[PDB]
Write a protein that binds this ligand. Structure first.
Ligand SMILES: CN(C)S(=O)(=O)N1Cc2ccc(Cl)cc2[C@H](C(=O)Nc2cncc3ccccc23)C1
Ligand SMILES: CN(C)S(=O)(=O)N1Cc2ccc(Cl)cc2[C@H](C(=O)Nc2cncc3ccccc23)C1
Ligand SMILES: [Cl-]
Lengths: 305, 301
């Protein structure tokens, strides 16, 4: 029993975090084999961030301009190259703690763990979701740039996010590990804003099934709905459209609890139109959308890494 | 900006998780130097749990009855002893991954990270608080016994909790790393129940100061309160009494934001009276009590 927002164990990622300094800027880097990955804005200064030509700023830097620190040991940079918005620093030493890994690009709604770091030192780990507007509601301060997002599947670490910046609403923007931004964001000091956000419907449904598994049934009803009727209701409440793929993905949870996906949708419709009426679901007065169907299955089954 | 429930990086603890097997029972152990710590109920045969005599069950055991597995390597047990509700298995290999550590006993209201494990394999990490009723609202399944709670301030891991059991309300009970239970609980399957739980007042106040630091001020008011009038109101909402120690502890946050502790207490009084009125504080529709004053300073500053 119990349902917590749970992160993956961060150990395999902790062994890869390094400090990257270039000029007056210090941020975090990911050391995998003999390459250190970090945001390319590490080469930028005060005037530079306003309108930066990164190829021009990069051609002016030499290997020794980049200071890489792994714990109390300085790594020597022997090469440098740019791939989209990520800088790749070739180092002389391969990381002996390099885990089995992949670089993966996630879709909005998918969740991941973030190992927040400052000066190449991990300070905390939290779980979060890629919002439908491509931002993450994270917890970051200055010097957190280069912190990474990941999932673990068996013994393989899938790196899916690298932190680049904070937007004026307090939300965060970043890239996959190939340097491609999530969302319509650019790595520069300019007027940018997150678009109107929506609720991740398949995730709320998964969390309602987690509540049923933990013994919370007050919200269930005798009713069912159609996918078409529910999608009209969901669109009215800034909820993401629920697709047939979402319905299929929820199949295992529907079989385990005996509540058809469109039966749980009729519960969700009633919650959206009437509220909770002073009640909570899993200790929450709001409908939680940062647990995927797979996160619910993993936590309510005990999968280990 | 942003305020999340944050756990400590679990790496230093992952390198200590082992599987402990005695007969048909398998649970988790903490391998530090040449000792493996685990709940002493690993020697019980289910029926034993109603009225176990641990001294009588342990005297019947030898070193080779305990199977310890660290990854794919079996450790050899060379000694065994009981300290309160913890079994200490002396092993022939010191853990090369032993971090700098301490055993600390925490007070209710204190927070910590839990590395939930099954078969000596870590599956997840989450942030918890010791409830005023000495239970923890964790997320644990069968086989999670022996999972540990910790804080990592600087490079030193302070182990403060070891999981032992789930109570009938779904909440969890356990011990410090010296085997002393938190609360009036016993490692026995007798009728036990968590006492009425209360809200950790000093933690809610700390979280209201975190909201002010992040720019949320809608809940503040022009009022102040005496400490006594605040506690008379707080007790009616099942909130823990706020002590002078709590007021002193909140001093730094009061100085940083310019809002006196008793002024912040008046806002809390009003929030308990009025509810949120469709608003949120730091993305929450409920008053959060699992962030200490120290956690707020650590994350916001
Ligand atoms: C107005 N800015 C927030 S700034 O500090 O001047 N800024 C400009 C900027 C522009 C472009 C890019 Cl790609 C990066 C960045 C950096 C940036 O977003 N860093 C930060 C990241 N995360 C949390 C932060 C929390 C407080 C401050 C910075 C934070 C730095
Ligand atoms: C009635 N029981 C809950 S039981 O499963 O029979 N039980 C009896 C018991 C009594 C005393 C002690 Cl010290 C331990 C234990 C064990 C026990 O609490 N383990 C478990 C621990 N944590 C989460 C669990 C989540 C589901 C199941 C067990 C869980 C086993
Ligand atoms: Cl304490």
């Amino acid at each position: 029993s119990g349902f917590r927002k749970m992160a993956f164990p961060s150990g395999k990622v902790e062994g890869c975090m390094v400090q990257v300094t270039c000029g007056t800027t210090t941020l975090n880097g990911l050391w995998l084999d003999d390459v250190v990955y970090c945001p390319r804005h590490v080469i930028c200064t005060s005037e530079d961030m306003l309108n930066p030509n990164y190829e021009d700023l990069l051609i002016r830097k030499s290997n020794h301009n980049f200071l890489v620190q792994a714990g109390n040991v300085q790594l020597r940079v022997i090469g440098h190259s740019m791939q989209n918005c990520v800088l790749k620093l070739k180092v002389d030493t391969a990381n002996p703690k390099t885990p089995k890994y992949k670089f993966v690009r996630i879709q909005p709604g998918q969740t991941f763990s973030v190992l927040a770091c400052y000066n190449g030192s991990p300070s905390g780990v939290y779980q979060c979701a890629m919002r439908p507007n491509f931002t993450i509601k994270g917890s970051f301060l200055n010097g957190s740039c280069g912190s990474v997002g990941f999932n673990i599947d068996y013994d393989c670490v899938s790196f899916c996010y690298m932190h680049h910046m904070e937007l004026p609403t307090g939300v965060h923007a970043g890239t996959d590990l190939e340097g491609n931004f999530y969302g319509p964001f650019v790595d520069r000091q300019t007027a940018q804003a997150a678009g109107t956000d929506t609720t991740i419907t398949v995730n709320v449904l998964a969390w309602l099934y987690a509540a049923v598994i933990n013994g919370d049934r007050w919200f269930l009803n005798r009713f069912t709905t159609t996918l078409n009727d529910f999608n009209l209701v969901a669109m009215k409440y800034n909820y993401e459209p629920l697709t047939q793929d979402h319905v299929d993905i929820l199949g295992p949870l529907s079989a385990q609890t005996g509540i058809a996906v469109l039966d749980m949708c009729a519960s969700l419709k009633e919650l959206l139109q009437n509220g909770m009426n002073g009640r909570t679901i899993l200790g929450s007065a709001l409908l939680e959308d940062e647990f995927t169907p797979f996160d619910v299955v993993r936590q309510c089954s005990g999968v280990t890494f």
